[model samples]
Target: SHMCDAFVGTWKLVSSENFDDYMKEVGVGFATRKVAGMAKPNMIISVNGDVITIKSESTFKNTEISFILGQEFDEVTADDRKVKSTITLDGGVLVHVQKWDGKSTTIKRKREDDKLVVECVMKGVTSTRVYERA
Candidate 1:
């Protein structure tokens, strides 16, 4: 019943490409990236009024985010960076941007062909992750 309803559900990561270099761009310690690269986290989304909870679960860690669209808030990312984050919906795409220490990343979430697709970009580095309803 909502434009973002498509995003509300428990989804499992079915595939990911180039997430390694994305972590490197995020400043994750080289050693930690190895373990993180292998994690296929379950993505969860839920909305209450105008607030949404974004969360991911994995063998390595669980990351939960809180926000109201289009406003900036404090965030400690999965890679452990304390940053400023914002979430906004544009053309049915959930755009999440994080910035810290002069660096930034754009994370876009949308539905494609009945599955959830995530596109992540940090500078010139890009990563893609596809997830299916679980």
Candidate 2:
């Protein structure tokens, strides 16, 4: 079984860029976007064999997503959208793809030093989030 040791930890959101634009592109409401923009989310990641779980927690909302590697699953996003999601690890980077309503979103997470960098892309908007191990 493949182990994801680098990703199994609690991480705190340090910085995010273009997050509001990405949210707007995903059809988030103005009020919700404002609240999301101000919230500092923390992420907890756990991995066992091929099972990977990520929990994103914040004052605005909390979301938990669990999946097996290379397997598709139904996902209800925090913004209230039902989507199909798949995640895979490639060269030590985690890649996630979600499809819903004729649109697709891609997220990639890579570790650098003691930080995790996540890039999210939807429509033409792209956002980068940096997380530090906590």
Candidate 3:
């Protein structure tokens, strides 16, 4: 499927802006925020039919998550919160919605040429992360 094909690759983080603020809004502590801000992670995205898997690898921490389109699943976020997560592909962008307790976060990933741009929003904080093909 076109949706699945578009995200199948390894992406290395090239730039980030406002990530610390984003983490702070999500309740991440100072020590963790400092480490997270400095870690340049490589994200590997794969798909099989309707199932999608994302793997993030870094010196500080490595994590993986998998889910199907529009299907809600339990996710342990990088910030250590357990949430109900759903993903959708629309208008050439992949959107991830996460809900935990009464809080929510949204992450959108879009491809532009050889770059994958990710925007994360939580509370009123917004962060942008750009990745290049690895």
> How do the residues 26-129 of candidate 2 rate in per-residue lDDT, one tens digit apiece?
88899989998998989999986677999999998899998998899999887888999999889999999999988999999989999999999987789999
Per-prediction RMSD in angstroms?
Answer: 1.0, 1.3, 1.0
lDDT by residue (tens digit), candidate 1, 16-107: 99988888887889778998888889999998888899899999889999789998999987778899999999999999998899988999
Q: Model 3: residues >4 Å from true position, as ranges?
A: none
Residue 51 Cα positional deviation in candidate 3, in Å, after optimal superposition: 0.7
Worst 10-residue lDDT window, candidate 1? 23-32
**Runs off by more than 4 Å, candidate 1:** none
Q: Would you estimate the TM-scores of all the predictions?
A: 0.96, 0.95, 0.95
Q: Estimate the overall C-alpha local distance difference test score of candidate 3.
A: 0.90
The Cα RMSD of model 3 versus the native structure comes to 1.0
Give the per-residue lDDT digits (tens) of candidate 3, residues 1-134.
56668778999999999999999998889999998899999999998877789999998888899998899999887668899999998887999999988989999999888899999999789999999999
Of candidate 3, the 10-residue stretch with the lowest lDDT total is: 1-10
Candidate that scores best on lDDT: 2
List, in order, the clash count of every candidate structure: 0, 0, 0
TM-score of 3: 0.95
Error of 3 at 74 (Å): 0.6
Candidate 2 differs from the real structure by a C-alpha RMSD in angstroms, to one decimal, of 1.3
